[PDB]
Design a protein around this ligand. Structure first.
Ligand code: ADP
Ligand code: MG
Ligand code: ZN
Ligand code: ZN
Ligand code: ZN
Ligand code: ZN
Lengths: 648, 637, 143, 222, 49
């Protein structure tokens, strides 16, 4: 301690008596076996003497491996000024299992001892540092709870980690922390801090000794911030018949607004059971308690997904060695082919489709057109797949859904317009009418995979026009009218008329989609079936070897994140001329009868694909090779070559 | 001894010194000159520049910013003394201090609890504005147990009775009677604002909060406007229906109930005075200004005065500039190739005609409506977005994303009184402006009927949830329509091509057809324009007039109401005869007297664009040419 | 007494309105049979004190009386909603309304839709002189 | 007709001091004018006392005409002139004017209590049995007065470019009921009034006051 | 009445009667004490407690 204020931690809940009991007739806390002194000493020992043996430089960026990890963390804290120390419960478990167990089972008691230990170490060292408040230790990566509904009541008020998807986040709730009372006779002022969730009012003035003259001034008090996170749990242990689970989380004073709807997170927090009043106006409480999680730590990192927007935005994400490795990979000649083959390793020989998916993941170049007065430009890449229910179109959509962060899924008629855009529901914890988002908005800066796009009624299909054209969503209903942002990438999958591609019909009628809807797509892949014995034999061997069973996903994630962070391709003169020529030629070829015609929307599609290829190469400059690849992909997809003026 | 708030009193003294000593460049007492106007009734606020305050005394400005809530009453008292020692304002009159030009601006997402009680400025979009009710600021109560008068008890954004009767031997804490004739009130309005489009994070609804406008700021924010509110984030207690117990306030006196009166249950809670502490963040805006003012400073003369010298000189130059028509077209749509007729029509829509009411009361429509129907990917949505972005009071909506209530209006009941607030719809927010309906054909008849009534009688009648009203909606319509089957057919009529109801179509002043002719020259030109736009983003746009200048010119010209001279009448009738003779091949739609009315409105719009006081044969000729070009022939094999 | 023309647009079910009640004290069980209820829309405030305390020195409580249901002389009563005649409503106007209280043999005498003439007492509800409704001294009128 | 219309213009021309006093203290000056006009009309026609025993003095041609959007707490308890269009108009309800009560403990008839527009008259004890018993209105002996509640909003023609019309409630008493109809364009001279019962003293409510206009004069323009 | 009412009509205003059987009573005596005759001043009436 250096005189810096010790900030109250609402995430730990209202304090307790902290009663101490001697176990002999050593000095544990009542109901626990923590022994604050021993716990603090052991945590200081862990913090000053922990080395991760099998750590990796890739895993730990900006950290000297040999030097104590959390001491380096304290150095970073001193450099920056944010008094939050993120500690790994797995590291705690490895160092001392008993300390890990005590932390897990008694968080509200153990954690403040960790705060004391960390502050002692951090002010014994760096004795001149300035911080707005003492350091707060945030544990995380507890032993994952597979299914949150396997939690028994004997697991209440203890630390757990869950994985979920953020469905909704409420407005900020001002939580009082220090009531400011003032006498209405002599104006003497006093302050009362939250004792155990209750503020014992003065009841008598300490200046004029008048009884019940002290009025609580609301706006001269000290307040905290609270937020309610409605998170749909994403359990990995799903027993027969169990349905999706929605859980309530509460974030306090710094984790507020740190997660937006659509974000997949690992939340570490205290499992809290609370009473429910039978009525809002009575103090009777039902004998059955409803549970919710008090959040301690958000974790946006997952090993089987790409990097989120926040992770990409953060600068110190890659080491210099990793950056150089990524640059080398981009410097390789066939990086495009390598990444495409990396995509979906279990699906055989869809090279063009996987290239389209890769360009979709990389996106285009985000551009600002505010000055032009032109309206936002969609930098996302929309892809349609077409083929009977015998091809891997649905498998590709599922793979993209399981891969990308902010991935939403829809299928057939299981969706509606309001359920894809927004609606109004009475929040069943505040009894207030709150607005809720649809799948498209939940996948705002991600991908919406829409299977069975053909069997999708016009009422819900017509919403996608606005999303795929302007990236906005102007909901104008009774209560409030507002223009939400859905900058989503559409990955649609549609079946041919009569659920098979009959070679007696032309492509447009076989597809059976409006010209406007098809033009809104910048890629269309007709997953036709070639009656090739070679293809059939290769696929059969592939599947049998799959039954009796590379470019690593980690470096794939790193490449995509680096490209999004830094590479911002721009148009060169040769690329501009190539694009103009390509658009003219595309119009000429597509001016036939049954072919999918071409429009300025197709020109913009070529522009986006060229920018995506430039990103794939880390070029930062769109040029002739990029334009040529865009043209070749846009042709091979939709198979302009195999077609003819006599379409069919 | 009535403990003194020394910090606040020091702030009051310093602020009074600032008022009575600060001077402008001229060297006179600017705030003395301003307070000279405070003597008049219905005028009780003084506007003070935070820039001026910071210049005069940085420490005072920082103190005010960091302790605004606690010191604000003292600043008001300082201003009251400043006004009194000069003039003879009524003794009971109150004065308020509005602050403006605060250097820093925060985001509604950043309005955390740490911002409570300290000065801040935010930008928001007004959703709806409640009426102007008197509010209780300090009431004098009567005790019903001993008839003791407890005087000047403040109200903390809630009806607060005296915590205890003054009489020492009387512990009355319940039975008080407010004395209205002795209490003081202030003007009060609650306005719901929401987060602007730019500030939205990913996948989030625009956060909404209500701001409280006190005296002299009480009818300055209107629904749909972008406004900067400067004031103080506050917390107002609320009885929230939280099922779970939370924070509670109770007395520290260690009383306990005797047998038969055990202080338990509801009796125990009422004895201990347990009351839940639930709060909601509210904004107490001391001033409101437009986020992007049109003028640096509602008839033509008033607009002229509101304009600055430089702004008026620019407007006069543009008015005197021949070729202003083409200049404005290019500036409005620099990034759209071709479609000169469409650009001209949209410009004439933005300008509008002169609405009139006959002696019998018939309201002759004065604003023109334009519908663009064309092949896919022909810049219809782009025209709509251009107009929405440029024009003020320019609402945008899709064909099927809106309901009738969200497209015309809705009714809610004032949560603070018996009256009814009207949640304006898109056609109301676009009042005296433009409404851009994209995918116009794809709209249900249940909404097309509302749009038709709007375009018909320039009004929206609402009879819902206990209130009847007749809102005015003088909004032009810009529609985008897809032909049946998607592609326009040149061998059919416009009615056969589009599926808009005949009453809807009949009153569209202009109908522009954008047929996607697969022509090499146009393909190359459009490709060049698009690739140039995507290569040279910030450059490549050279609009001879900036959008702000065009907006100011529109606001000035709209105040002009062109006449129609006898020569103009003769030319008009001759042109109508010529158009009828054209009607007599087959046009995509016939020519009726509605075409004559549209032509008259277009001529008025041209005269207004040139700011002429008389409609001229040149304007009439331009309108007739535009209409004739719009009406295309039906080519058949 | 007023005679008015109208049309019945509704007719509530026929329910039982007490004309006499017998109230029994909880302590001494003594009764106050045959208390004459007023006719129409009006309530009765029960006695607060058992007047028959002379039968014994120890006293009965405050507000001791419970109404005995089986000792009540009830009658049929009905509520109807009269609406002004459509040919009587002026051109641009709303149809005025009135509430009708019907008694023993006026119950079910008319049904919704009948154009009727009602002769009755113009009376206001008398039920104890106790957001909207900003008026004061206004009570629900009825015939 | 029980009503007498007096031009404020002539009132100021002849006796200007009362003209100045009128807007500041409308209730008291109107009551005094009521009594004076009653005495004068009685002197002119002594036999008229048997007709309503009460005369209402309406004021016309108020110089300053406010607007519904421009009514602020500064105007409270003053005779303001406004114009508007009636949007709603409830039926002519009967209101208590000189209420008599029955003590439902001895059946004595508690005498006539003048009913004010701002407070529900409630008696104390019964003068006979000195009981605070429930009491109940004696409709047979009570004398009533017509009460109509209208809502007048800003004329859409007068509403500004960007703005929604604002509405104020008004009360018509015993001579003005059904003097206006929904849709009528009316000038209303009346007391912007606040102190009857309108105060959001409930939880989840700013201490704002509802307001009404005690219509003293109505003039349709058509 | 303390009893947790079960929704019935509440017990009367003054419902409590002493149960003389269920009481613990003790002896209690009242004595009169007088100022000692010597302690009384010469001309003075004795005090009593
Ligand atoms: N004539 C043109 N000039 C400039 N841009 C055009 C033109 N035609 C098409 N475009 C471009 O092609 C896209 C299609 O325009 P859009 O408004 O979607 O047409 P539609 O209304 O038919 O959907 C837009 O991004 C636009 O910038
Ligand atoms: Mg479009
Ligand atoms: Zn005091
Ligand atoms: Zn008292
Ligand atoms: Zn009895
Ligand atoms: Zn009596």
């Amino acid at each position: 301690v250096r005189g810096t204020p010790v900030r109250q931690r609402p995430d730990l809940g209202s304090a307790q008596k902290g009663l101490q009991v001697d176990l002999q007739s050593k000095l544990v806390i009542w109901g626990t076996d923590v022994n604050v002194a021993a716990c603090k000493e052991n945590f200081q020992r862990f913090l000053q003497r922990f080395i991760d043996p099998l750590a990796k430089e890739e895993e730990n960026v900006g950290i000297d491996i040999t030097e104590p990890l959390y001491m380096q963390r304290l150095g970073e804290i001193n450099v920056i000024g944010e008094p939050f120390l993120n500690v790994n419960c797995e590291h705690i478990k490895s160092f001392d299992k008993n300390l890990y167990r005590q932390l897990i089972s008694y968080p509200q008691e153990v954690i403040p001892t960790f705060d004391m230990a960390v502050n002692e170490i951090f002010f014994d060292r760096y004795p001149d540092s300035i911080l707005e408040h003492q350091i707060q230790v945030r544990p995380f990566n507890a032993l994952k709870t597979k299914n949150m509904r396997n939690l028994n009541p004997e697991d209440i008020d203890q630390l757990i980690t869950i994985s979920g998807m953020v469905i909704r986040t409420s407005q900020l709730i001002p939580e009082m922390q220090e009531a400011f009372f003032q006498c209405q006779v002599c104006a003497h002022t006093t302050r009362v801090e939250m004792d155990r969730g209750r503020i014992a009012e003065p009841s008598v003035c300490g200046r004029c000794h008048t009884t019940h003259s002290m009025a609580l001034i609301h706006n001269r008090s000290l307040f905290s911030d609270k937020q309610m996170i409605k998170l749909q749990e994403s359990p990995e242990d799903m027993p027969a018949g169990q349905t999706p689970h929605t859980v309530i989380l509460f974030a306090h004073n710094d984790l507020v607004d740190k997660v937006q709807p659509g974000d997949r997170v690992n939340v570490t927090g205290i499992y809290r059971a609370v009473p429910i009043r039978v009525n809002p106006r009575v103090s009777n409480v039902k004998s059955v308690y409803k549970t919710h999680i008090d959040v301690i730590h958000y974790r946006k990192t997952d090993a089987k997904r790409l990097h989120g927007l926040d992770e990409e935005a953060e600068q110190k994400l890659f080491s210099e060695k990793r950056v150089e490795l990524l640059k080398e990979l981009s410097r390789k000649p066939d990086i495009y082919e390598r990444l495409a083959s990396a995509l979906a390793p279990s699906i055989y020989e869809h090279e063009d489709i996987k290239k389209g998916i890769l360009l979709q993941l990389f996106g285009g170049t985000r551009k600002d057109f505010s000055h032009t007065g032109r309206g936002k430009f969609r930098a996302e890449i929309n892809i349609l797949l077409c083929g009977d229910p015998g091809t891997s179109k649905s498998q590709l959509l599922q793979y993209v859904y399981n891969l990308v962060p902010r991935g939403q899924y829809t299928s057939g008629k299981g969706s509606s317009a309001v359920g894809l855009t927004a609606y109004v529901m009475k929040d069943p914890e505040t009894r207030q009418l709150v607005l809720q988002t649809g799948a498209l908005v939940l996948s705002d800066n991600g991908i919406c995979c829409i299977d069975e796009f053909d069997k999708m009624n016009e009422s819900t299909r017509s919403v996608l026009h606005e999303v795929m054209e302007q990236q906005t969503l102007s909901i104008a209903k009774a209560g409030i009218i507002c223009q939400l942002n859905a900058r989503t990438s559409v990955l649609a999958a549609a079946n041919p008329i009569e659920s098979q591609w009959n070679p007696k019909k032309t492509t447009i009628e076989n597809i059976q989609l409006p010209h406007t809807l098809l033009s809104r797509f910048d890629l269309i892949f007709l997953m036709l079936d070639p009656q090739d014995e070679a293809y059939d034999r290769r696929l059969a061997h592939h599947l049998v070897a799959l039954y009796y069973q590379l470019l690593d996903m980690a470096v794939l994630k790193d490449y995509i994140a680096y490209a999004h962070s830094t590479i911002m391709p721009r148009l060169s003169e040769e690329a501009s001329q190539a694009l103009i020529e390509a658009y003219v030629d595309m119009r000429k070829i597509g001016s036939s009868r049954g072919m999918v015609s071409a429009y300025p929307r197709q020109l913009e599609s070529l522009i986006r694909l060229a920018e995506a290829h430039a990103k794939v190469r880390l070029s930062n400059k769109v040029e002739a090779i990029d334009v040529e690849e865009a043209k070749r992909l846009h042709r091979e997809a939709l198979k302009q070559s195999a077609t003819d003026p006599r379409t069919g | 001894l009535e403990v003194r708030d020394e910090v606040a009193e020091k702030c009051q003294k310093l602020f009074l010194d600032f008022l009575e000593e600060f001077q402008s460049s001229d060297g006179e007492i600017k705030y003395l000159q301003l307070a000279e106007e405070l003597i008049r009734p219905e005028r009780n606020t003084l506007v003070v520049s935070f820039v001026d305050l910071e210049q005069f005394n940085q420490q005072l400005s920082t103190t005010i910013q960091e302790e605004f809530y606690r010191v604000y009453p003292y600043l008001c008292r300082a201003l009251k003394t400043f006004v009194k020692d000069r003039k003879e304002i009524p003794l009971a009159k109150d004065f308020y201090v509005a602050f403006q030009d605060l250097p820093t601006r925060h985001k509604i997402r950043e309005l955390t609890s740490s911002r409570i009680g300290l000065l801040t400025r935010i930008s928001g979009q007004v959703v709806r504005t409640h009426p102007v009710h008197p509010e209780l600021v300090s009431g004098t109560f009567l005790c019903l147990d001993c008839q003791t008068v407890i005087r000047d008890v403040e109200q903390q954004f809630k009806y607060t009775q005296p915590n205890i009767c003054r009489n020492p031997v009387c512990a009355n804490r319940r039975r008080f009677l407010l004395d209205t004739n002795k209490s003081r009130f202030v003007d009060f309005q609650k306005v719901r604002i929401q987060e602007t489009q730019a500030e939205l994070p990913r996948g989030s609804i625009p956060r909404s909060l209500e701001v409280i406008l006190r005296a002299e700021a009480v009818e300055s924010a209107q629904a749909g406007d972008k406004c900067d509110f400067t004031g103080t984030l506050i917390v107002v207690p609320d009885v929230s229906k939280l099922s779970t117990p939370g924070a509670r306030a109770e007395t520290n006196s260690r009383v306990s109930g005797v047998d038969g009166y055990e202080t338990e249950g509801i009796r125990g809670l009422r004895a201990l005075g347990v009351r839940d502490l639930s709060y909601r963040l509210v904004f107490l805006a001391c001033c409101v200004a437009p986020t992007n003012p049109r003028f640096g400073g509602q008839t033509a003369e008033s607009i002229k005065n509101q304009m600055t010298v430089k702004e008026w000189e620019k407007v006069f130059e543009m008015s005197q500039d021949k070729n202003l028509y083409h200049n404005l077209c290019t500036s409005l749509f620099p990034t759209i190739h071709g479609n000169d007729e469409v650009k001209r029509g949209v410009l004439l829509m933005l300008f509008g005609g002169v609405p009139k009411t006959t002696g019998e009361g018939t309201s002759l429509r004065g604003d023109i409506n334009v519908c663009i129907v064309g092949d896919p990917s022909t810049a219809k949505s782009q025209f709509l977005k251009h107009v929405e972005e440029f024009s003020p009071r320019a609402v945008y909506t899709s064909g099927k994303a809106s309901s009738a209530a969200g497209l015309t209006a809705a009714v809610v009941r004032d949560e603070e009184s018996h009256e009814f607030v009207i949640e304006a719809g898109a056609l109301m927010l676009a009042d005296n402006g433009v409404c851009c309906i994209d995918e116009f054909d794809k709209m249900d008849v249940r909404d097309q009927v509302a749009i038709h009534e709007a375009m018909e009688q320039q009004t929206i009648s609402i009879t819902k949830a206990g209130v009847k009203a007749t809102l005015n909606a003088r909004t032009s319509i810009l529609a985008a329509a897809n032909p049946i089957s998607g592609h326009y057919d040149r061998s059919k009529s416009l009615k056969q091509n589009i599926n808009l109801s005949a009453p809807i179509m009949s009153r569209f002043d202009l109908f522009f057809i954008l047929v996607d002719e697969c022509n090499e020259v146009t393909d190359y030109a459009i490709a060049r324009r698009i690739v140039d736009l995507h290569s040279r983003i910030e450059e490549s746009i050279d609009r001879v007039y900036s959008l702000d200048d065009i907006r100011r010119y529109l606001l000035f010209a709209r105040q002009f109401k062109p006449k129609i001279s006898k020569e103009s009448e003769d030319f008009i009738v001759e042109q109508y005869k010529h158009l009828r003779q054209r009607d007599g091949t087959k046009s995509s739609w016939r020519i009726t007297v509605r075409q004559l009315e549209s032509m008259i409105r277009l001529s008025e719009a041209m005269a207004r664009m040139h700011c002429c006081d008389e409609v001229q044969p040149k304007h009439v000729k331009e309108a007739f040419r535009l209409l004739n070009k719009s009406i295309i022939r039906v080519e058949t094999p | 007494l007023v005679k008015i023309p109208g049309i019945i647009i509704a007719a509530s079910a026929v329910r039982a309105k007490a004309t006499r009640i017998s109230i029994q004290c909880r302590s001494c069980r003594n009764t106050l049979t045959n208390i004459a209820m007023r006719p129409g829309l009006e309530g009765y405030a029960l006695p607060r004190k058992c007047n028959t305390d002379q039968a014994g020195r120890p006293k009965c409580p405050l507000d001791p009386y419970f109404i005995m249901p089986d000792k009540c002389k009830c009658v049929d009563f009905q509520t109807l909603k009269l609406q002004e005649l459509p040919d009587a409503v002026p051109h641009g106007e709303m149809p005025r309304h009135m509430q009708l209280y019907c008694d023993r043999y006026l119950c079910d005498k008319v049904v919704p839709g009948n154009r009727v003439t009602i002769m009755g007492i113009y009376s206001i509800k008398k039920f104890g002189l106790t957001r909207d409704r900003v008026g004061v001294g206004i009570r629900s009128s009825y015939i | 007709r029980e009503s007498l219309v007096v031009n404020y213009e002539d009132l100021a021309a002849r006796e200007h001091v009362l003209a100045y006093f009128l807007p500041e203290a409308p209730a008291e000056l109107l009551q005094i004018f009521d009594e004076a006009a009653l005495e004068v009309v009685l002197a002119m026609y002594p036999k008229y006392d048997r007709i309503t025993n009460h005369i209402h003095v309406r004021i016309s041609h108020l110089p300053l005409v406010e607007e519904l959007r421009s009514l602020r707490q500064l105007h409270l308890n003053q005779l303001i002139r406004t114009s508007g269009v009636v949007t709603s108009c409830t039926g002519v309800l009967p209101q208590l004017s000189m209420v008599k009560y029955n003590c439902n403990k001895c059946n004595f008839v508690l005498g006539p209590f003048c009913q004010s527009q701002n407070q529900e008259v409630k008696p104390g004890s019964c003068p006979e049995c000195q009981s605070a018993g429930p009491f109940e209105v004696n409709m047979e002996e009570t004398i009533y007065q017509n009460y109509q509640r209208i809502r007048i909003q800003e004329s859409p023609g007068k509403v500004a470019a960007g703005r929604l019309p604002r509405s104020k409630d008004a009360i018509l008493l015993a001579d003005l009921v059904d003097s206006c109809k929904p849709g009528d364009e009316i000038e209303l001279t009346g007391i912007y009034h606040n102190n009857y019962d309108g105060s959001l003293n409930t939880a989840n409510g700013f201490p704002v006051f509802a307001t009404v206009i005690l219509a003293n004069h109505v003039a349709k323009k058509d």
